Amino acid sequence: KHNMKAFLDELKAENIKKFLYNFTQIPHLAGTEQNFQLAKQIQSQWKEFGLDSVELAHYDVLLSYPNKTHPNYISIINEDGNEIFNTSLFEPPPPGYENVSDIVPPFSAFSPQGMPEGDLVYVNYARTEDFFKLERDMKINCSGKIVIARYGKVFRGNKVKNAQLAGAKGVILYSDPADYFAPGVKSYPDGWNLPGGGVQRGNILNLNGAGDPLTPGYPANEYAYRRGIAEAVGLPSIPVHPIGYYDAQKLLEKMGGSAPPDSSWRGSLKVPYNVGPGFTGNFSTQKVKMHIHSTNEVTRIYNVIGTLRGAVEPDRYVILGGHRDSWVFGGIDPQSGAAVVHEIVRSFGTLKKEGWRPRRTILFASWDAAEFGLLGSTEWAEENSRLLQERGVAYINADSSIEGNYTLRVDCTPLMYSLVHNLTKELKSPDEGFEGKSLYESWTKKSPSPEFSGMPRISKLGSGNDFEVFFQRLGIASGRARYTKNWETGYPLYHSVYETYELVEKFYDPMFKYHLTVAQVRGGMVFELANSIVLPFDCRDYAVVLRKYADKIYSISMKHPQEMKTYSVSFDSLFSAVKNFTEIASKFSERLQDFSNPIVLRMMNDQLMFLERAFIDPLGLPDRPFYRHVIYAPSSHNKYAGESFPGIYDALFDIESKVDPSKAWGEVKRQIYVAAFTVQAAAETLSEVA
Amino acid sequence: KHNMKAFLDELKAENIKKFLYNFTQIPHLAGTEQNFQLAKQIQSQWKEFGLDSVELAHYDVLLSYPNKTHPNYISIINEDGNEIFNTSLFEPPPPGYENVSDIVPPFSAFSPQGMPEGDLVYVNYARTEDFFKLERDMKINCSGKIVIARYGKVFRGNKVKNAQLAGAKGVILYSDPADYFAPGVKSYPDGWNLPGGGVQRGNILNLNGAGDPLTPGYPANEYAYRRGIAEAVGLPSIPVHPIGYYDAQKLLEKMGGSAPPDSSWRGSLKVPYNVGPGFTGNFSTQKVKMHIHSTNEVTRIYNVIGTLRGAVEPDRYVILGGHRDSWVFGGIDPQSGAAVVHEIVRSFGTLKKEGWRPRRTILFASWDAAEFGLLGSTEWAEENSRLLQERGVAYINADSSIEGNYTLRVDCTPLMYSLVHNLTKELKSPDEGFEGKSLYESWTKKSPSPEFSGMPRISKLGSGNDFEVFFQRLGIASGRARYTKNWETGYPLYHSVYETYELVEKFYDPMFKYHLTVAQVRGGMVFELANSIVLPFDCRDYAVVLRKYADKIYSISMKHPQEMKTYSVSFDSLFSAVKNFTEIASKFSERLQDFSNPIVLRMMNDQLMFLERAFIDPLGLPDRPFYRHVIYAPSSHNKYAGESFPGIYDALFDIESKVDPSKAWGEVKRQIYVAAFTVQAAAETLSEVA
Ligand SMILES: *[C@@H]1O[C@H](CO)[C@@H](O[C@@H]2O[C@H](CO)[C@@H](O[C@@H]3O[C@H](CO)[C@@H](O)[C@H](O[C@H]4O[C@H](CO)[C@@H](O)[C@H](O)[C@@H]4O)[C@@H]3O)[C@H](O)[C@H]2NC(C)=O)[C@H](O)[C@H]1NC(C)=O
Ligand SMILES: *[C@@H]1O[C@H](CO)[C@@H](O[C@@H]2O[C@H](CO)[C@@H](O[C@@H]3O[C@H](CO)[C@@H](O)[C@H](O[C@H]4O[C@H](CO)[C@@H](O)[C@H](O)[C@@H]4O)[C@@H]3O)[C@H](O)[C@H]2NC(C)=O)[C@H](O)[C@H]1NC(C)=O
Ligand SMILES: *[C@@H]1O[C@H](CO)[C@@H](O[C@@H]2O[C@H](CO)[C@@H](O)[C@H](O)[C@H]2NC(C)=O)[C@H](O)[C@H]1NC(C)=O
Ligand SMILES: *[C@@H]1O[C@H](CO)[C@@H](O[C@@H]2O[C@H](CO)[C@@H](O)[C@H](O)[C@H]2NC(C)=O)[C@H](O)[C@H]1NC(C)=O
Ligand SMILES: *[C@@H]1O[C@H](CO)[C@@H](O[C@@H]2O[C@H](CO)[C@@H](O)[C@H](O)[C@H]2NC(C)=O)[C@H](O)[C@H]1NC(C)=O
Ligand SMILES: *[C@@H]1O[C@H](CO)[C@@H](O[C@@H]2O[C@H](CO)[C@@H](O)[C@H](O)[C@H]2NC(C)=O)[C@H](O)[C@H]1NC(C)=O
Ligand SMILES: CSCC[C@H](NC(=O)[C@H](CC(=O)O)NC(C)=O)C(=O)O
Ligand SMILES: CSCC[C@H](NC(=O)[C@H](CC(=O)O)NC(C)=O)C(=O)O
Ligand SMILES: *[C@@H]1O[C@H](CO)[C@@H](O)[C@H](O)[C@H]1NC(C)=O
Ligand SMILES: *[C@@H]1O[C@H](CO)[C@@H](O)[C@H](O)[C@H]1NC(C)=O
Ligand SMILES: *[C@@H]1O[C@H](CO)[C@@H](O)[C@H](O)[C@H]1NC(C)=O
Ligand SMILES: *[C@@H]1O[C@H](CO)[C@@H](O)[C@H](O)[C@H]1NC(C)=O
Ligand SMILES: *[C@@H]1O[C@H](CO)[C@@H](O)[C@H](O)[C@H]1NC(C)=O
Ligand SMILES: *[C@@H]1O[C@H](CO)[C@@H](O)[C@H](O)[C@H]1NC(C)=O
Ligand SMILES: [Ca+2]
Ligand SMILES: [Ca+2]
Ligand SMILES: [Cl-]
């Protein structure tokens, strides 16, 4: 037979290992020749694996690179103007790669140029809460200051956005060992920990889903008319540079001014963690000077797009996509995902060569420039938005297959919960102690649901990966899965030069069994979405979560009972809509269970496909036109995290500080109306059609 | 058989006459009890005619009414402050209706209150060109002036918008006999001409497709959160009132200042048509005083929505809709349309009672509050936008079936051109001299196409009627048809109390043969759209017009050859996209002609259905978020008229006057890119799907 078991059995750990090795021997930075070379290899393959068509889709987008002959660095400068300490010009390369060409040194992508001189303030994680506390509680002024912040907890851009609106002037990001050095583990190359010379790269844009900063709304094709830099989307206005903890130590050791308010503000370095501003008297006259010469440049990028045409519904698309571009070698991010995609395509192609085709079309994508703002996936989705709107069944992401070796992690729409539960009950656990048990069993034991006994945790989609445009802008049901760490104990080498094939093969997954398990989950999800007669979505699972999210937003509002009395703020409409959704979804499920009348079947499959679509508001969220999903958006305080009912959540956020409470509570009421309406409208897509 | 001929043969002129009489005996102003009573009657039915379901959909929207105990009027006031002449408090009622209650007197809906005092300037038609000429050529200052404008040529709001931005202060609209008195025809009741006491009502909002001014984007349901009046959409900021030509004569006869620049500025009254400002010396010290006490009030409105469920594709909707609310009796506008809809439903229902159902679902709508800004159709579309997005095949409008008795008028998307040609070749001409000839033949002879021999004129859809939200916001293929006048020789009694059953029965259509012909066209279009196995759209007809529109926009730009050289303004991308659309549409038509594989058939029908949808830009047009169709929008200078490539057209408009030509031509280039991209993206929806 050609069934899912045949597809799954064909996947091999040894192939994924080969690929990973194949994809990680040289750097594949977006917009470079090496990454174009890899795109052409993958295109070739995907063709030989058996796909019907494999094309490159190219765009010309804004990228950012250091100047090769004028390197970025940070100095401590005395009152004479002498530079008495310099941060590193590069991370010490890993063993055997100390002659690899074109390792681009650590930098913050899209930093402007500048050489700002000043005094440090230490802002902990640079979280919204961290800046409130500094200013409101400690009455500390970030204005005119160079802010030094440790990485962690939230997306770095959000840190930079936070630093900007606090008035800083120049920004230094560093990796504190408290956050990136696991206790009792050796640093690379002898273990998977971050050494003091390692540095986390990463872009610091705040794009809010726009994609290429010069062409918001439209693909960056060969006739595109571009915004000027001054009008670009999401660019930071102050210089920014990242460093490792050896260099941070040398910068922090002199901090004066106020003590840290508490132990949650102290990292692990042997320094005071004083918030500043400025140094201590001996060195009160020394300053910190940044030197940033990176340039933004419009550069061609290339997605590989493979098609396996469906036998019965070729105009319905199930998409498996993940990025290919890396900061350096990409041993985990993204090649541990890309190698899994490659083996998935190989397996589908083996079935295809035997005469099989999926019911629906499967599209496979190798996205470019994800590291510079999800640019490749976003421009492609902009180009193809009408086809994806009307034909897109689901998107399964495929960035890193691993970020630990403890258990499964799944983030997805509630419409895929039942699919994931059923699939994982049929897969073998790769975990020690669970041999002969299901993946569902190991996962449920290690990552219990907060809400239900005997079920596993499944998280919300936010942003920070290539599902963003599909889910949050277009409203196509999306999911992702990977192996993860035990959150009761990022990953330390994230976006550093030390992310290598050896890191994975020696320390994370020597037998490639976790990679294989992830391939079975991602590939199995794609198989069911593309082959099941009835789409494998359960609308009742959305009804359950919508009640949870309504309870939670109401609870936030109920912190302000006087104002809700004064401004007649009622959530009755939203609960009514959720109750209606629950009722209608229950009746739809009954019809689905007990309706070869392929029209009632295409009808009901279209109702399932367009249900995620119904949560889109074509007006977007306030000042964020490309975040259109009314139930989920990336948190306005952390792009990585999903927020439920974001429009109401943001309207309530810090509302007690708003100067005009009448206007502010009016806006909460407006967001309640929009959310209640959207939930009712989505519910009504599941009613009998006439 | 139950085929189209059976449907058509069942339609009867005598029923349409009965319904018309039934719908026009009392006023049916939006938001009044009489119009709710009529809604309930139509609901009852439409149920007894055989529809599967018939419901009222109600909303609470902003309406505008005069104050019953403080009537609106205009005065000439002397230097003593004595009111020496007053305009009428009402139009003399027509014979036999001089005891009808609740005729609301002439007013401009949504006028603010005020009693502004000042001097007149006469602004011809108040067109954009009319104000350029006044200010730029004649150097006349409209600031602080009461503007008196004649109606005609463009939608009145656009006049009011134009007057506002010129700085006026108070506005008087009047009907000049040059525009509303047909030579050699008697005035009502002895002919169809406008008497000197007749007045054209009408709203003066500039909503740009928003619908209810308080709830843009969302239906005005029972939990809606409303904008404050100060933030409402489209409200005028200066008082406005309409008058007849007897009263205008008394206001114009004293005008001084500059002569009219030319004979296109002179109407037919026995006055100078002096542009002013102010009166002549004898009466230099007299002023004009407005007294406006109308109030805006949130008021419930009711649409009737009837469903005839499809036998095979119940989740595909073909909509026949037209409004029910009238200014007074609505003898032409809208009851000549509503009576045709009523007889269409009756005919479909007779087939239904015999066991027939259409292939697709037909929805029938009696819209409310169209006269106050297309409010009923727009709120309903907002409420149901997801269902209409994904399921809407076509919308056929049904306001007035007649505005003359000369020939057919059709305005529709190019996707319906072939449908209309084929249908009219099968219908009998009702015209004198064409007995035994086809409607296509009479129509083609009387209204030749400018472009092709042996074909009839078909116009572009703009706005000013209830197709607007469906076509211009949602991108559902739309059309309208009615009998019209000979444009080589509005209608005079438009929006006056004299629009009665007798007007129609005595003067426009005594045998109800033109009404019957229109019923056959509108009903025949609905029948084919709802029953044809393959949707009756020809994508090649769009390819033809897109080339015409590209040629025309390029020609406008080419008035500025130096600037196109300087700013490298190329239309190459748009012509390339149009060429591609032509090629792909030709190949799609081949596949359509020669593909009982119902999936290739649902696939290809979805490609046809979503082709109009592909011309929507989810970002809308600049500052007009609810006008989203990239090919057509209502003209920014006349809501009634459709404009092609509106985004580029508006970017080029009066560009020679822009202060920063670099920025302005940059914006033309941006609009070219958006249009080329949209045309290519629409083309690509017709490519093979995988
Ligand atoms: C969840 O689904 C239910 C359907 O089961 C749906 O119930 C609807 O609720 C609305 C709002 O409460 C009802 O609206 C009423 O409609 C009647 C006519 O049928 C009107 O007369 C009512 O207006 C009067 O009363 C109001 C409230 O006191 C006054 O404000 C108003 O001025 C009038 O005096 C009112 O509009 C509607 O009938 C039902 N529909 C049903 C039962 O079918 C509910 O709205 C859904 N939830 C959401 C969020 O959509
Ligand atoms: C109408 O349909 C046709 C398809 O039949 C489509 O043609 C496409 O045109 C684009 C733009 O001209 C072509 O783009 C080229 O792609 C190649 C790779 O295949 C690149 O190497 C090219 O870039 C080089 O040259 C450019 C121009 O001088 C430089 O600006 C650039 O820096 C590079 O040096 C270029 O991007 C594309 O190949 C074809 N596709 C085909 C033939 O299949 C056309 O675009 C469609 N019209 C619209 C409006 O979409
Ligand atoms: C990654 O694998 C690819 C595919 O096997 C290798 O590319 C092939 O290399 C051989 C030998 O140079 C060529 O003859 C083939 O034409 C290549 N095939 C392609 C590009 O599709 C590539 O060498 C491997 N890379 C590494 C670093 O091992
Ligand atoms: C997950 O598996 C369950 C259990 O088999 C599926 O639920 C069953 O579905 C069949 C077919 O509709 C029904 O006959 C049973 O009554 C269902 N059992 C239940 C609900 O306990 C479920 O549909 C699967 N989910 C998918 C495929 O998304
Ligand atoms: C318009 O026609 C309707 C439908 O025939 C008339 O309403 C009916 O009137 C009779 C007599 O009053 C009632 O018994 C019916 O119940 C009504 N039917 C309805 C409302 O569906 C109505 O009277 C006519 N109006 C005019 C002005 O002639
Ligand atoms: C309008 O009528 C024409 C003439 O019958 C239709 O065009 C024909 O369509 C049939 C079926 O696809 C083809 O076999 C013929 O070759 C066509 N004749 C032509 C193009 O001259 C046309 O499709 C009709 N338009 C509709 C139904 O929208
Ligand atoms: C906002 S565009 C940059 C996105 C980029 N994303 C990442 O680095 C993702 C985040 C995640 O999904 O775990 N990394 C991986 C290993 O998946 C970043 O955060 O730098
Ligand atoms: C912009 S909302 C008001 C719309 C209203 N429309 C009209 O009056 C329409 C215009 C048309 O489509 O011929 N009149 C009729 C007889 O169709 C008006 O212009 O007053
Ligand atoms: C890199 O730096 C040097 C010094 O400014 C300069 O010569 C060269 O142009 C720079 N390259 C850029 C800005 O791309
Ligand atoms: C911090 O001090 C600077 C001195 O230039 C001042 O301008 C600024 O307002 C202060 N910061 C805040 C947040 O008030
Ligand atoms: C792999 O799992 C083991 C056992 O729990 C643990 O000691 C080791 O640190 C894990 N490796 C990584 C990279 O997490
Ligand atoms: C109508 O006019 C009179 C005078 O202002 C007033 O008594 C009444 O309130 C008005 N009605 C309104 C404003 O609805
Ligand atoms: C017309 O005159 C008034 C006098 O108050 C003046 O303020 C205004 O600027 C003039 N109009 C224009 C268009 O300049
Ligand atoms: C009806 O048609 C006749 C003949 O052309 C014409 O004389 C008459 O004015 C028309 N009536 C109307 C209302 O246009
Ligand atoms: Ca873009
Ligand atoms: Ca509204
Ligand atoms: Cl992922």
Ligand SMILES: [Cl-]
């Ligand atoms: Cl019409």
Ligand SMILES: [Zn+2]
């Ligand atoms: Zn990644």
Ligand SMILES: [Zn+2]
């Ligand atoms: Zn990354």
Ligand SMILES: [Zn+2]
């Ligand atoms: Zn009308």
Ligand SMILES: [Zn+2]
């Ligand atoms: Zn009207």
